[PDB]
């Protein structure tokens, strides 16, 4: 039932046509400005060929008013559990030395655990000093060494990409209908630019804009819902804050790759002659992920996830005040000069007057083929354009008025010949 509302005519400065094989191929090349519709209402730029019936339509439907977030600095975090491997060796045997086990380098691989390999798994090599003699397990009075080869392993079966926001971009999801019939769905946020087959679209005027998101970090989960954290974003991988052991990709977290970043000296150790209890003290991200799982209201809005595309968004309770900018990159628009005829009939009229929502109308268009109907009044206040189809079909669009007592005679034409049509109905005051 809801259809095109803001119906404007294209200027002749960027409008041209050329007859090629008894076919008026209208071409557009320039920049046009059209008024954006509200929730439910649509907007289209009507094309004018070289005569009456030659008229196309570029109707664009507005889904809803969304407030997307702008990403930037992010990282892949996760939980990990170390696996300590102890192997006490007496002095003067192999590499167990009193002056070597103390100043043991991390990059060097010990001979007691060199059979594992030099893989990309996060590993580290330590060196502790034990006891000597027959009191523990040696032969010389010099203290023995303790070769430690601790490697990290992934604990959680999924990874999280914790990002942040710097500004809330007011994104408007649009479903642009081309002239030939190809329906495409795009989106425009604040000053975004999206290229299409017939040109490019961009948003100019903006209205809603939540300011104050630099002190809040978001959590993204692939396949499930999102989350929200009430603290500023952290970048330095220190101990205590969120992001002690981070990475740069999902495979670097699920497989524990060496490309991830971590704080120096973070794995504890408990040397017990031959035993070892290596552990860490990292913050579990699923704790805040569960304590702050969306939906989570803030002040007077509602934060939730998006549908289809991955990304954080926000919902508001304001109006829709924006201006859409259209651009044509020399798109050929053809239309046959031998159009078909059809008759229309009145059905009902319910809506409002002098408002952004307008008022929907019901019209029964009965024709013999796929065409285009064009209706215009006498004082030049409104104009009705509905794509005609075959058989008895129910059509109609949004028609805004300035009087609750709607009573105006309309003249519709399908292929040149005009026919009278009287409409009526009452409306309510909607501001």
């Amino acid at each position: 039932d809801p259809g095109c509302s803001e119906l404007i005519q294209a200027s002749s400065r960027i409008t041209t046509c050329s007859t090629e094989g008894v076919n008026t191929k209208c071409r557009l090349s320039g920049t046009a400005l059209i008024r954006a519709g509200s929730v439910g209402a649509e907007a289209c730029l009507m094309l004018k060929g070289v005569k009456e019936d030659q008229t196309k339509f570029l109707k664009i439907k507005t889904v809803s008013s969304e407030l997307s977030c702008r990403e930037g600095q992010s990282y892949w975090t996760g939980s990990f559990s170390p696996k300590c491997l102890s192997s006490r060796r007496c002095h003067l045997v192999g590499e167990c030395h009193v002056n070597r086990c103390l100043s043991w380098r991390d990059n060097e691989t010990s001979a007691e655990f060199s059979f594992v390999g030099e893989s990309t798994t996060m590993r580290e090599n330590k060196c502790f000093e034990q006891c000597g003699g027959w009191g523990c397990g040696c032969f010389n009075v010099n203290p023995s060494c303790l070769f430690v080869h601790t490697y990290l392993q992934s604990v959680r079966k999924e990874a999280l990409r914790v990002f942040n926001c710097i500004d809330w971009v007011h994104k408007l999801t649009l479903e642009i209908t081309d002239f030939d019939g190809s329906v495409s769905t795009i989106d425009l946020g604040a000053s975004s630019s999206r290229f299409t087959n017939w040109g490019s679209v961009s948003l100019s005027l903006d209205a809603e804009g939540i300011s104050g998101s630099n002190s809040f970090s978001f959590i993204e989960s692939p396949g499930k819902g999102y989350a929200i954290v009430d603290e500023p974003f952290s970048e330095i991988p220190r101990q205590g804050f969120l992001g002690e052991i981070r990475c740069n990709s999902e495979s670097s977290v699920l497989s524990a790759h060496e490309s991830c970043l971590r704080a120096p000296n973070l794995i504890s150790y408990k040397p017990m002659i031959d035993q070892l209890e290596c552990t860490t003290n990292l913050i579990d991200p699923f704790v805040v992920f569960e304590r702050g799982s969306l939906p989570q209201t803030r002040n007077d809005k509602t934060f939730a996830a998006s549908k289809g595309n991955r990304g954080v968004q926000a919902f508001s309770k304001g109006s829709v005040q924006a201006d859409l900018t259209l651009m044509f990159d020399n798109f050929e628009v053809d239309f046959v000069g031998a159009a078909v005829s059809c008759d229309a009939a009145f059905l009902n009229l319910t809506g409002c007057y002098s408002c952004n929502a307008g008022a929907r109308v019901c019209l029964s268009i009965t024709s013999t083929g796929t065409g285009s109907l064009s209706a215009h009044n006498k004082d030049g206040s409104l104009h009705i354009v509905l794509p005609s189809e075959n058989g008895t079909k129910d059509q109609c669009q949004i028609l805004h008025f300035t009087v609750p007592e709607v009573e105006e005679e309309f003249m519709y034409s399908c292929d040149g010949d005009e026919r009278p049509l009287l409409v009526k109905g009452t409306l309510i005051a909607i501001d």
């Binding site: 050329s18 090629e20 191929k25 071409r27 090349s29 087959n197 990159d329 020399n330």
Partner: protein, 301 residues
């Protein structure tokens, strides 16, 4: 995954009518023989497309596979007078080509393999427009453009060239430019479907779906130094074949393998499978995706 860039699946023929003087060392294409229409495609760091799609067919092999039609005439004579049909399609292909050649194949407008010819004794020049006199002369054909070929039977004859911002490219008359235009030389890729037209490409979007295909395995030999043999001779699960062949989990998971009793080693290939294209916002399965360097006339105020 040993790199074997000599085994050609299917027919493996590289010759055109009117100039069949290379049917001895190139019919089929194997390790033995010397053909200039295949040896130039194995250059190091020159043709990355053929190196990436090694286990795939080309253009001449696709024509000899009875899956695509050939141009008429297939070999335009550059020596005869009164013009020739192969002039406006090759003159716009401002590219470089070595000397000592006699033929050069390309793609026309009707999606057919259009080539030229040089009767003895004439050789191609630096451009390939005319033939001059002459050392050995390569009697094959120098590919002026890089492309591949594969098996596909997907419909798509009503899909033509869909470009944006270009009024005329190559030689085809696309959209009508009522204003001005700028003549430039850029590299624009192209594509071809099953019995269609030369559909140029503006946004190259290709993908490779590696699946258990018979053309994605190479069989070796057992001596007692592992040379290639054949893949169509290995027995299948529930079928029949010549000598028994074995391999890893990929070859044994789809075919029959006896390990010790087998006399061949079938290993998995590298860079081969189902290759699709993304045109008009929909995924399709073409015959061969390639690129060229021709005259591009974009729009201009």
């Amino acid at each position: 995954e040993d790199p074997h860039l000599r085994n050609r699946p299917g027919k493996g023929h590289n010759y055109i009518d009117g100039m069949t003087q290379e049917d001895a060392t190139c019919k089929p294409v194997t390790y033995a023989g010397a053909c200039s229409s295949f040896d130039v495609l194995l250059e190091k760091g020159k043709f990355p497309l053929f190196q990436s799609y090694a286990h795939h067919r080309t253009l001449l092999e696709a024509v000899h596979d009875t899956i695509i039609a050939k141009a008429d005439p297939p070999s335009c004579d550059l020596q005869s007078a009164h013009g020739n049909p192969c002039m406006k399609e090759k003159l716009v292909m401002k590219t470089h080509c070595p000397n000592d050649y006699q033929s050069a194949h390309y793609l026309n407008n009707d999606g057919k393999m259009a080539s030229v010819k040089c009767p003895p004794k004439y050789e191609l020049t630096e451009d390939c427009n005319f033939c001059r006199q002459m050392a050995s002369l390569k009697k094959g054909s120098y590919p002026l453009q890089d492309l591949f070929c594969q098996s596909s039977e997907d419909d798509g004859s009503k899909l033509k060239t869909k470009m944006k911002g270009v009024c005329e490219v190559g030689v085809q008359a696309l959209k009508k430019c009522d204003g001005q235009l700028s003549t430039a030389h850029e590299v624009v890729p192209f594509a071809v479907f099953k019995n269609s037209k030369k559909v140029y490409l503006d946004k190259l979007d290709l993908k490779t779906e590696e699946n258990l295909l018979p053309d994605s395995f190479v069989c070796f030999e057992h001596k007692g130094e592992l040379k290639s043999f054949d893949i169509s001779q290995c027995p299948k699960i529930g079928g029949h074949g010549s000598k028994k062949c074995t391999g890893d989990a990929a070859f044994c998971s789809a075919y029959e393998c006896t390990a010790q009793y087998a006399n061949a080693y079938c290993s998995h290939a590298n860079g081969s499978g189902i290759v699709q294209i993304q045109v008009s916002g929909v995924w399709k399965k073409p015959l061969c995706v390639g690129y060229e360097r021709v005259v591009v006339k974009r729009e201009l105020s």
